[PDB]
Amino acid sequence: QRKLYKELVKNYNPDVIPTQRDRPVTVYFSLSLLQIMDVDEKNQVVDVVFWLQMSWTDHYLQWNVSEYPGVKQVSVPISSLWVPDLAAYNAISKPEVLTPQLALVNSSGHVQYLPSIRQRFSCDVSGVDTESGATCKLKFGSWTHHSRELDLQMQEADISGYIPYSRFELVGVTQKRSERFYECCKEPYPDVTFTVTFRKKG
């Protein structure tokens, strides 16, 4: 009854961002910091783990609830369908994905993708021992698309889930969306900056 798969990826090319023109693919960002692995005061960098919520609507992917007997949603590997080319601007090391490369999809076309990631970003950690604490900004954003091609809207800033017994204690978490125009491209470049401040417990 799962002929759906064979059809879903029939005339589908994952290298093409799904837009009906005029209307840009809107992706909903959200970072759920899990734990702060380590901090290098010497080279100014932080090793961190975190779930990363990503969801959009692929107009190509969608099926008639009837033509398919009780097929609510399906788990498809991120390589079979399109996915936002998000990039950790201030990252200094290839992102190590821990969780399976699988994304869910609504019969309507809503694609939900949340991968577990460990990665190191460039950041000032000199004031991590001070009670004031050091702060890091994890700027994310499409790498080859702008507002007219792909809009990046944030939604949930989940502080919950951070390891309780971590040597570091979160004093504050700020997730904010923001745009910026460059000397070209009438359209602006949307980016979500996940700011985090933390001190050393004890």
């Binding site: 759920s32 779930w51 919520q53 949340l114 989940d158 889930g161």
Partner: protein, 73 residues
């Protein structure tokens, strides 16, 4: 007093045991709380459970008044 319990699978409607006349619903918010949703808990208690900072409690007396957020009272 008939209630909804998450102790059984699937969530069935068990008759809230003696002494306990209140059906409740406590919801946490873990890691998956951003995608899967807030943790759902349904049970029985004589005295309505106290709310924790991040938690969210809700009690009642009506039968089957504490259903799953995706059902009907």
């Amino acid at each position: 007093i008939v209630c909804h319990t998450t102790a059984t699978s699937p969530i069935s409607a068990v008759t809230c045991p003696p002494g306990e006349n209140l059906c409740y619903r406590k919801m946490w918010c873990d890691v998956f709380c951003s995608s899967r949703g807030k943790v759902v808990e349904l049970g029985c208690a004589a005295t309505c459970p106290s709310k924790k900072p991040y938690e969210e409690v809700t009690c009642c007396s009506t039968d089957k008044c504490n259903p799953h957020p995706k059902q009907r009272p």
